[PDB]
């Protein structure tokens, strides 16, 4: 606990050091752009002390924050405030029953484990209903956006000699008459998009030396004529790729974007199954053109489930290859001894700083088109990583390295490591996330060597799975060792205020989702609950508490039944855009804009980056 | 095995005795109506030897049988022929590997357990695709039928003072314009329907004595004036109930039948979620008016999940109260000794002759409106009964009464009882089902004491769960004790030929489903597979076969993944009437009948029995 004390001290001092340097950076205006990316994307702004920062983030109201920076960001903040709502009462009720233990006491705290799970389920129900309610209100209040008016047909039958464009056009002229507006064939511009990305990358690389020389071109060997030949060769390849993409046969794909005159028509197309064999004509709710990760499109849907399976195998080999750094961290967990206990957590965060990136890459390979759903799946895989590797794997590595109640007496000892870790990653890691060292340094390098901000998304695939990890920790250790509970609670407080500021000021919504991820979030925190209970049993079973097993069996039963309740009761608010919402919003829009001429708008929406 | 021999002998002799008496009954024409109910419902017919019966049932082709007696009946026969296709190769491959055993042999037959499950999965895939293909072809080939054109809205908000009729009319005039044809409010005629059923019941009771006396009314006390007062009181109550049903407030329910001009519109309504909160405006594919079990309608959908839960509790108390007759049967299982071994099975069938009826009642209480889905749920509960009571409960009772490999060495001994049982229930029970003693005696009593056949449905909720029970037995004992395999195989042969005859000649389709139950069937036989594997492990684990555990872990993994494949690949053919099928069939129908005037037809379809 002295090691926990010094970890918490080092990390509150690191949080306040980050706050100091970050206030300084905000005050110096030449990096102001980095710290206010919104108010600059929105154009609202242009061109002792710490006490004016944290309150100013919460001076922003709720609905105005929604209208400001999208609903997905504000409901990510809502995941933070849900952590507060779920672990502040849990902390009160756990410190109300922690004083007796520090036998019959375990009977007196299994009812408190109940209280924990009943409270998190009541909170998750109220909160799931709240996020769904604000989601549907936001979807009815969001203006025109092609994501509402269109759908994605993934697999079509390429059998006839007739092209896919006129094929899907005929399919929907037949099936959805007086509703189908325009198809939009997805191109295999993956090669052309990669070519243009390479083009602009080497273009800024060329501008580097262009702005560098200014007296006499040094032309490092690694010359500038090399990059001139680069732009020439890429221009010739772009000419060839444009000649190939204007040609139909090879470039077109089985998928297309089908737009509809009414949002109701798009909603019927999305909800329903279209054709006889569900392997084709699958109709996904088409995310925005700014949303869908175009490189992941133009992949055969037949070769999509094999990609998901090979990525599951990659995730398996990852967890069984990422188990050795987790064991290294645990052995680092078990003066300078407390500094080693803290180095354990800091090296775990250093090992997990590249984990969300490679999970993003894994999900990009997994075939998900919408970067919204791509980050949702990335967060889901990061979470089933943290669950099986950073929590189950880390706790079993701690139990193994305590040998050098067998495992049951060591998991509250691994909670000490988890405290040091929530301090290095939740406290100090998020406090460093405020600085945005990477975005700021990138912006400075770009401007030094017009306006091309693109700051960086809210980082759902990175931040959110850590929040589910801390839900997991707080739920497994609210029943076991509430010494962690205050630390994850105050982390939720911090994380909320800082990420709320960042959504107010820097974080943009790369994907304009409508809190579509909250099912996942719920389906993860609820699984956290399950993992708590199936773990709490594993701690009261090895402790020979015979009376604790039946109630801890009845508990996850009611928890998973409650998850089924919330599923059937609000998941239709996210996963299935309802028809009444669609038609009501559509009639309101037609009342406002009576001509609305949206054929050209929708057919030009989902072309491709050009 | 001598007891099995005499059970099989008694039961083949009972099968042939039933065949004899049944040929005799068919040949005597005064009961002909019972044995040819079809050809009399269809009006086709009106007004040594055994060798002309069994072939004549198979002289009927397939597609003509579909057009003859519905697709659900022919695909029930297809479940039988699937039993043949799944257990004849399984029998060949099991008698090819049964001669060595009657250690290393278990390694040589775990690959054969694989072969069994791989073959049943290939057969279930081909067969699931076949039944789905013929289902979609039948749905495109079926003529007009209100089930295709309408939908059921279960829960509406009764909040406004405005009535539910105009409420749903306004809801769908707003949401489905140019598509919504007519609402049809479901009435709480449950009381009126029960009253009219009592009316006609006591009416035929009165006609009993009317046709009985004919010289001088004896007027048993239990007089005929009593039944005259019965008809008078029921007529007054019918007047009151009609005055109440023509009144709106109390009689109308939250549910209604919404019909649409196009089958495509009905299909979009059915597939989609309608309103914001999924607890209301649920839109079920509305089964035919002849189908939907009207008494089960007019129940609050809020009080429907509580009915499902109380029926789950009733099923639990049933299995834990029906465990004592299963134990009685098992103790009867363990000269006259073989006669007791056979009495075990005959008393189990005698105990299970009322099981499908009370499961039908349980499902009627469980809130399912369509007697199609009502029999599907009844068969599902009968099957999760047979699985946990007549197979798991019976095998554990046999293992317990062998005490008077502990359980592993007794389950192949319980397979002897299962042989005696498939002989008394599958062989002799189905051979008695041919006679239809109950329908025939009922018809004779009715005519003796016009034309009011109503023979009795195919009995899906009764026959089908027994077929899944025999799938369960054949799969658990193909890997364990293939002495049963030939008996269940020849039962599938028999059952097929007899039920095929009965569908040709007597069995009518009370519900004109479109093989909607086959998902269930598959989802049950596939669960049989799982139950086989999770049981085969339990037999190779208690036998200390260390090499058998990993492959028998990988087996049910691929089986449940295969079930997921078939789910995602054909369940959309049953559970979700696709939009292309709907619109194609609708355009064909509009090409044939261009006026089609179906507003009156559809709005008069789903009134109520009157």
Declared resolution, Å: 3.5
Phi and psi at residue B89, to the nearest 5°: -65, -35
Counting the structural domains of chain A, the total is 2
Q: Do B278 and A569 touch (CB under 8 A)?
A: yes
Chain B 326-385, CB below 8 Å of chain A: which residues?
none
CA B588 to chain CA centroid, nearest Å: 32
Q: Do A573 and B264 touch (CB under 8 A)?
A: no
CA of A593, closest CA in chain B: separation in Å? 19
Pairing of strands A283-285, B252-260: unpaired
Gaps in chain B following residue numbers (C to N > 2.5 A): 47, 102, 222, 334, 404, 449
CA of A549, closest CA in chain B: separation in Å? 21
A195 and A140 housed in the same domain: no
DSSP string, A502-525: HHHHT-B-SS---STTHHHHHHHH
CA of B579, closest CA in chain A: separation in Å? 5
- For residue A423, being part of any structural domain is answered with yes
CB contacts of B580 in chain A (<8 Å) are 171, 174-175, 274-276, 281
Say what angle helices A371-385 and A355-365 make with each other, to 10 degrees.
130
Select from B135, B279, B283, B579 the residue whose CB has the most chain A CBs within 10 Å, as the one to mutate to test that interface: B579
Find out whether B112 and B551 touch, Cβ atoms under 8 Å.
no
A442 and A519 housed in the same domain: yes
Q: Summarize chain A as % helix, strand, coil (round to 5).
A: 70, 5, 25
CB contacts of A578 in chain B (<8 Å) are 272-276
A195 and A129 housed in the same domain: no
Identify the DSSP state of B51.
G
CB contacts of B285 in chain A (<8 Å) are none
How far from A271 is each of A391, B61, B125, B175, B572, CA to CA, in Å? 37, 39, 26, 15, 12
Nearest to A372 by CA among A307, A314, A457, A436: A457
Identify the DSSP state of B41.
S
Find the residue in B nearest to A280 (Cα). Answer: B569
- For residue A394, being part of any structural domain is answered with yes
A465 and A521 housed in the same domain: yes
Coil, helix or strand for A447? helix
CB atoms within 10 A of CB A177: 12
Q: Do A273 and B578 touch (CB under 8 A)?
A: yes
CB contacts of A316 in chain B (<8 Å) are none
Q: Do B568 and A276 touch (CB under 8 A)?
A: no
Q: Do A276 and B576 touch (CB under 8 A)?
A: no
CB atoms within 10 A of CB A142: 17
Find the residue in A nearest to B281 (Cα). Answer: A580
- For residue B128, being part of any structural domain is answered with yes
Chain A 564-583, CB below 8 Å of chain B: which residues?
568-570, 572-573, 576, 578-581, 583
Q: Do B281 and A175 touch (CB under 8 A)?
A: no
- For residue B260, being part of any structural domain is answered with no
Select from A180, A265, A268 the residue whose CB has the most chain B CBs within 10 Å, as the one to mutate to test that interface: A268
Give the whole-angstrom CA distance, residue A171 versus residue A165: 10
Give the whole-angstrom CA distance, residue A8 versus residue A17: 14
Coil, helix or strand for A283? strand
Nearest to B253 by CA among B165, B137, B384, B357: B165
Find the residue in A nearest to B273 (Cα). Answer: A578
Give the whole-angstrom CA distance, residue B96 versus residue A336: 70
B101 and B207 housed in the same domain: no
- For residue B176, being part of any structural domain is answered with no
Phi and psi at residue A345, to the nearest 5°: -65, -40
B88 and B196 housed in the same domain: no
Q: Do B175 and A580 touch (CB under 8 A)?
A: yes
B103 and B202 housed in the same domain: no
B32 and B108 housed in the same domain: yes
Q: Both tokens of residue B61?
A: 């082709």
Terminus-to-terminus CA distance in chain B, angstroms?
Answer: 58
Terminus-to-terminus CA distance in chain A, angstroms?
Answer: 58
**Residue B416 CB-density burial (10 A; 0-12 exposed, 13-18 middle, 19+ buried):** buried
Find out whether A515 and A447 touch, Cβ atoms under 8 Å.
no
Chain B 133-192, CB below 8 Å of chain A: which residues?
136, 171, 174-176, 178
B438 and B345 housed in the same domain: yes
CA of B590, closest CA in chain A: separation in Å? 14
Say what angle helices A355-365 and A305-319 make with each other, to 10 degrees.
160
Residues 6+ positions from B415 with CB-CB distance below 8 Å: B473, B477, B480, B481, B483, B484
Helix (H) or strand (E) holding B285: strand B283-285
Q: Do B268 and A268 touch (CB under 8 A)?
A: yes
CA of A521, closest CA in chain B: separation in Å? 20
Q: Count how many pairs of residues, chain A against chain B, have C-beta atoms within 8 Å.
A: 92
Say what angle helices A460-477 and A62-95 make with each other, to 10 degrees.
20
B224 and B138 housed in the same domain: no
Final residue of a structural domain among B199, B224, B245: B245
Find out whether B262 and B181 touch, Cβ atoms under 8 Å.
no
Q: Do A580 and B279 touch (CB under 8 A)?
A: no
Q: Both tokens of residue A136?
A: 């549907």
Q: Do B274 and A175 touch (CB under 8 A)?
A: no
Give the whole-angstrom CA distance, residue B131 versus residue B126: 9
Find out whether A291 and A211 touch, Cβ atoms under 8 Å.
no
- For residue B283, being part of any structural domain is answered with no
- In this complex, the residue of B175, B279, B578 whose CB is nearest that of residue A274 is B578
Give the whole-angstrom CA distance, residue B167 versus residue B286: 19
- In this complex, the residue of A175, A264, A573 whose CB is nearest that of residue B580 is A175
Phi and psi at residue A491, to the nearest 5°: -65, -45
Give the whole-angstrom CA distance, residue A174 versus residue B585: 12
Q: Do B272 and A579 touch (CB under 8 A)?
A: yes
**A312 contacts chain B (CB < 8 A):** no
Positive or negative: CA dihedral A431, A433, A439, A441: positive
Give the whole-angstrom CA distance, residue B273 versus residue B260: 17
Find out whether A91 and A489 touch, Cβ atoms under 8 Å.
yes
DSSP string, B176-241: STTTEEE--EEE-THHHHHHHHHHHHHHHHHHHHHHHHSSS-------HHHHHHHHHHHHHHHHHH
Find the residue in B nearest to A577 (Cα). Answer: B273
Pairing of strands B185-187, B150-153: unpaired
Q: By residue range, what is the domain housing residue A226?
A: 190-245
Final residue of a structural domain among B245, B277, B312: B245
B61 and B209 housed in the same domain: no
CA of A386, closest CA in chain B: separation in Å? 24
Chain B 241-270, CB below 8 Å of chain A: which residues?
264, 267-268
- For residue B321, being part of any structural domain is answered with yes
Select from B175, B180, B263, B308 the residue whose CB has the most chain A CBs within 10 Å, as the one to mutate to test that interface: B175
Identify the DSSP state of A7.
H
Identify the DSSP state of A274.
-
Final residue of a structural domain among B205, B222, B245: B245
A90 and A214 housed in the same domain: no
Find out whether A14 and A430 touch, Cβ atoms under 8 Å.
no
- For residue B290, being part of any structural domain is answered with no
């Amino acid at each position: 606990l002295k090691d926990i004390g010094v970890s918490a001290g080092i990390n509150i001092l690191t949080a306040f050091i980050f706050f100091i340097i970050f206030a300084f950076l905000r005050l110096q205006p030449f990096n102001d752009r980095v710290y206010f990316s919104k108010w600059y994307l929105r154009g609202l702004r242009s061109s002792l002390k710490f006490l004016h920062w944290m309150p100013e983030a919460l001076k922003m109201p709720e609905r105005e924050l929604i209208d400001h920076a999208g609903l997905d960001s504000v409901v990510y903040l809502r995941i933070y405030w849900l952590g507060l709502k779920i672990f502040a009462p849990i902390a009160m009720l756990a410190w109300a029953v922690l004083v007796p233990v520090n036998s019959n006491r375990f009977w007196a705290h299994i009812i408190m484990a109940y209280a924990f799970t009943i409270w998190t389920c009541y909170m998750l129900m109220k909160e799931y209903e709240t996020v769904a309610n604000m989601r549907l209100q936001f979807l009815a209040s969001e203006g025109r956006r092609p994501d509402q008016f269109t759908v994605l047909v993934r697999n079509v039958p390429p059998d006839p000699d007739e092209t896919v464009s006129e094929l899907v056009e005929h399919f929907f002229l037949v099936n959805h008459p007086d509703n189908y507006l325009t198809h939009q064939v997805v191109c295999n511009a993956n090669k052309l998009a990669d070519l243009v990305s390479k083009k602009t990358k080497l273009q800024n690389w060329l501008d580097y030396y262009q702005l560098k020389y200014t007296r006499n071109n040094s032309q490092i060997r690694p010359a500038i004529e090399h990059y001139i030949a680069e732009v020439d060769k890429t221009s010739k390849e772009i000419a060839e790729e444009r000649e190939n993409v204007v040609n139909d046969q090879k470039s077109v794909m089985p998928a297309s974007f089908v737009s509809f005159k009414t949002r109701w028509a798009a909603a019927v197309c999305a909800q329903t199954t279209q054709t006889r064999n569900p392997t084709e004509w699958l109709t996904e709710w088409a995310a925005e053109p700014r949303d869908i990760y175009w490189p992941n499109l133009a992949i055969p849907y037949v070769s999509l489930t094999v990609r998901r399976l090979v990525m599951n195998v990659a995730f398996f080999f990852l967890t069984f290859f990422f188990i050795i750094p987790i064991a290294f961290v645990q052995s680092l967990a078990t003066i300078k001894s407390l500094i080693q206990g803290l180095l354990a957590g800091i090296a775990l965060k250093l090992f997990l700083i590249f984990l969300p990136a490679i999970l993003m890459t894994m999900s990009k390979f997994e075939g998900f088109t919408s970067v919204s759903f791509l980050e949702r799946r990335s967060a889901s895989r990061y979470y089933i990583f943290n669950l099986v590797n950073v929590f189950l794997g880390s706790v079993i590595a701690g139990a193994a390295f305590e040998q050098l109640k067998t495992i049951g007496m060591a998991i509250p000892m691994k909670a000490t490591f988890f405290i040091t870790y929530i301090m290095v990653d939740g406290w100090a890691g998020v406090a460093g996330e405020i600085l945005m060292l990477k975005p700021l340094i990138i912006y400075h390098l770009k401007n030094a060597f017009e306006e091309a901000m693109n700051p960086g998304s809210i980082g759902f695939n990175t931040g959110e799975p850590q929040i589910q990890l801390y839900f997991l920790l707080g739920l497994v250790y609210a029943p076991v060792t509430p010494m962690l509970l205050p630390f994850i609670l105050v982390f939720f407080a911090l994380a909320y205020v800082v990420y709320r500021h960042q959504i107010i000021n820097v974080y943009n919504q790369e994907y304009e989702s409508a809190a579509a991820f909250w099912p996942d979030v719920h389906g993860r925190v609820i699984t956290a609950l399950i993992i708590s209970q199936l773990l709490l049993m594993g701690l009261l079973g090895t402790k020979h508490a015979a009376s604790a097993a039946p109630f801890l069996i009845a508990l996850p039963v009611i928890t998973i039944g409650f998850h089924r309740f919330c599923k059937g009761r609000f998941e239709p608010a996210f996963v299935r855009y309802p028809l009444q919402e669609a038609m009501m919003k559509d009639t309101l829009e037609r009342a406002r804009e009576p001509n609305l001429n949206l054929k050209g708008y929708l057919q030009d929406a989902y072309i491709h980056p050009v």
